[PDB]
Structure formats: C-alpha cells, structure tokens
Structure 1
Amino acid sequence: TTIVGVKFNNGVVIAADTRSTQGPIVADKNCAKLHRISPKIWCAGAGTAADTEAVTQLIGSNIELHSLYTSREPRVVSALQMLKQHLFKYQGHIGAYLIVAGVDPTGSHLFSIHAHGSTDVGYYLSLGSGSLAAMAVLESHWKQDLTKEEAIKLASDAIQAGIWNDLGSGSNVDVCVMEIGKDAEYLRNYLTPNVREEKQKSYKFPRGTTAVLKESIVNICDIQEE
C-alpha cells in the first residue's frame, strides 16, 4: 500500500493506490482503499486489509448512531478517538494503519493512526510500504497555503512515487477531496497510468476442445406447484 493525506487552504485531500497483494502475488489490481466513515470523514488504510475495512465500518456505524443521537454532524476527533481506543484495546493485533481526514463544524482535520493506538497530527502524512517514496515527494514539494488544485497534484504525485518505486504499490490512483462548506468529492480512478497493452494473440478456444463426461441441469428454482 501507498496512502497519503495533504491539507490545503479550505480543506484536506487524501489519496491511495489500488493494488492488493498476497505476498509477491497481486490479488486485486483495482482495490478500493479509500473508505467512508461518514459523508465528510474519509480514511485510507494500510496493513491487514480486512482489519482496515472492519474497523472502519465499525467506527463508521457508531459514528452514524452518535450523529443521530446528538443531532449534530460527526467530528473527525470523534472517529479518531473511537479508533485509537479500539485499536489500543487489541494491543496491535488488529493490523490497521490509517490516515483519517475530514471536515466538520470545527474545521478541516488530518490525522494518522497506528495499529497499537498512537495518533499523530500533520499537514502532510503518508502510510504503507510506499510511505517513504511518497514522503520524499511531500517533503520536496509541500508548502504552506496550498490551493485545492495544488494539493490534489501533490497527493497524486506522492502516490505515483509509490506506484513506480514500491513493489507493494501499483495500478491506479484514488482521491477524495474534502473542502469546507462543500460536499466531499470521491474521485475513483483519478489516474490510470497502468493499462495493460493489447495481447499479441487471442486464446479463445474452438468449441468442443475440452473433454466432458457428464452434463446435467441444475435446479436453482424452488419447489413447483401442481
């Protein structure tokens, strides 16, 4: 995984690659690492894929119920606190490393959170196996008072660094922009720099090529009338 988070003038942006691995094998070439906790609070996850989803959905569920109870829009600090206390309780056995970002009535926020329950504040952050490749880009090009368009560029450039230079990262770039006073825009496959070239040959077989022993109709319908 490569994931990043970048703050800007009137909000915050997060981004991620789309590769998932089973050791050296690529299980999914277009994975979705940008998760929704609430409408305007999104998180990106690295580490154990099931843990990042499960913990994200759990806190997102409890945040929705909290928002309903309090008649207020959810805050990023609430998601942060609920996440770290949950992760801390399991002493790092839930391998979820997340970048949490969002906008709320308090303003725009950006946090990182580790599997053991430690949280961190920043203007720019990166997590995952390609975090060093991405952070090199962020440290080179980040500045104070970024615009929305500059921040999306910086974010996707940071993810690309991971894609090209880290073997654990690849395929496409996902982005989510959370600006104050606006709906959050989720840009699935914002970049597509790794399309497979046409194959030299078609491997469509002649019908009847495969040897068969028995055929039978499978009854999927329910028990019938009459």
Structure 2
Amino acid sequence: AGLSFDNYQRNNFLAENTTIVGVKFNNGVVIAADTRSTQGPIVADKNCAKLHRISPKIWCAGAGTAADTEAVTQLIGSNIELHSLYTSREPRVVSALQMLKQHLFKYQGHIGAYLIVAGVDPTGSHLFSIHAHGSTDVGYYLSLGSGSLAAMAVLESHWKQDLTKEEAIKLASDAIQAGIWNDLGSGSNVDVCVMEIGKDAEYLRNYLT
C-alpha cells in the first residue's frame, strides 16, 4: 500500500550502467505567479497556470518537483473537503498548514514540494511558506522560485502596513514582472488570485499580458 518502492534496485543498476509572490493587505491576501513552463532551456508552455486551489478560499503555488507539488496539493485538498463536510464548517488555513506540515515531515524531505499558501477563513486572512522537510513560516509578504530574489527586492521596496486591495494587486504584479524581466525562468504572463474577507475569491488569469 502507498507509494511503491519496487524497481528501486533495478533503477540503481541501470543508473550504474518561476516567480511566486504572496502579499497581505488590510482586508485580505493576494497570490501571484508567472506562466512560463520550461523543460530545461526549452519553453514548453507560454501560458501555464501555477496557482492551485486547495479550497475555494485557500490557494497555493509551488516549486520543486512539479508532480510532488500537484499530488500533495490535491491530497490536502481532498482531506480539507472531507474535514469541512465532517465539521460542517468553513475550512481554516491553519488546518491545511498542519496537514501539509505533518505529511511532508512524514516523508523526511523526499517529497520535493515548496509552497506558498494564502487563504481567508472566518478567523481572518493568512499567508504561509512551507518547506519540503516540514518547516513552516508566517509572513506578510513572501517570494518563491528562481526569480524570488528580484521579486523580494521589489516587495521590500514598496510594502507598507496600510495597503488597499488595488495597491496590493499592483505590488504583486510588479514583483512578478521584475521576476519576469530579470530571471530566465520566468517571463510570459502574470496570474493573480485575490482572497478578500467576506467575499468570494477572485481568480484573474493573465492579469498582465
């Protein structure tokens, strides 16, 4: 049961012979990403959706092993949906964080998924970073990927406590744009998702083209 270890020895014998940002604003959170998907130096896809939905108001974006990121996100989404049905309550970002942290710690870093998770729940707005080995951290603004340094520079340039929705969207878009221009891993478009307290989540595909 579970993930299989068959053909491990056989594979050994045969061998022997992206910019993601999250920004908090006064009434919610925003997550943004680029749309370039590459297989080595070759651009495989110029319009790839990297923003994934754990739950209707909890979204995430990942880096590392793409299959691991997708699989872990989907498994946690299924667990979150079942838990919400069981408790008859809106899912909380803290619960998804706990599930992700314990699942990643169980595999001792062998599941290569690094995540930014943003969400809104009845307790408020939340933004978290999740490492492959199981460590998690909280922050007001986060960056991830090969273009994370340029995006973080932009975020450190123009971030403040009193940010409106429009200012937060513009700041996230500018950070993704900087990662697009200055990093070979990014470059095509900007996808945004805005989660505001008391309202539905707004998914803007190709906000900047």
Aligned-partner Cα distance in 2 for 1:47–1:20: 13
Helix, strand or coil for the counterpart of 1:111? strand
CA deviation after TM superposition for structure 1 residue 48, in Å: 1.3
Contact 1:13-1:151 at 8 Å conserved across structures: yes
Contact 1:87-1:116 at 8 Å conserved across structures: yes
CA deviation after TM superposition for structure 1 residue 23, in Å: 1.5
TM-score in terms of structure 2 length? 0.89
CA deviation after TM superposition for structure 1 residue 131, in Å: 0.5
CA deviation after TM superposition for structure 1 residue 106, in Å: 0.6
Helix, strand or coil for the counterpart of 1:185? strand
Aligned-partner Cα distance in 2 for 1:131–1:75: 27
Identity %: 100
CA deviation after TM superposition for structure 1 residue 24, in Å: 1.2
Helix, strand or coil for the counterpart of 1:93? coil
Deviations 1:71-117 (A, max 9, x none): 00000011111111111111222111110010001100000111111
CA deviation after TM superposition for structure 1 residue 172, in Å: 0.6
Greater share of helix: 2
Deviations 1:187-213 (A, max 9, x none): 0111xxxxxxxxxxxxxxxxxxxxxxx
CA deviation after TM superposition for structure 1 residue 46, in Å: 1.4
> Which stretches in structure 2 are left out of the alignment for 5+ residues?
1-17
TM-score in terms of structure 1 length? 0.83
Helix, strand or coil for the counterpart of 2:144? strand
Q: Which aligned runs of 4 or more in structure 1 are off by greater than 6 angstroms? A: none
CA deviation after TM superposition for structure 1 residue 69, in Å: 0.2
Deviations 1:41-91 (A, max 9, x none): 000111111111111010001100000000000000111111111111112
Aligned-partner Cα distance in 2 for 1:89–1:23: 30
Matches within 5 A, 1:143-154: 143-154=160-171
Aligned-partner Cα distance in 2 for 1:96–1:27: 21
Match among 149, 168, 178 for residue 195 of structure 2: 178
CA deviation after TM superposition for structure 1 residue 175, in Å: 0.3
CA deviation after TM superposition for structure 1 residue 39, in Å: 0.4
Of structures 1 and 2, the one scoring higher in RCO (CA 8 A, sep 6+) is 2
Aligned-partner Cα distance in 2 for 1:18–1:77: 28
Matches within 5 A, 1:73-92: 73-92=90-109
CA deviation after TM superposition for structure 1 residue 170, in Å: 1.7
CA deviation after TM superposition for structure 1 residue 174, in Å: 0.3
Say yes or no: does 1:32 pair with 2:59: no
Helix, strand or coil for the counterpart of 1:109? strand
| Number of residues of Structure 1 aligned to a counterpart in Structure 2 | 190
Contact 1:2-1:46 at 8 Å conserved across structures: no
Aligned-partner Cα distance in 1 for 2:50–2:98: 21
Show the counterpart of 1:156: 173
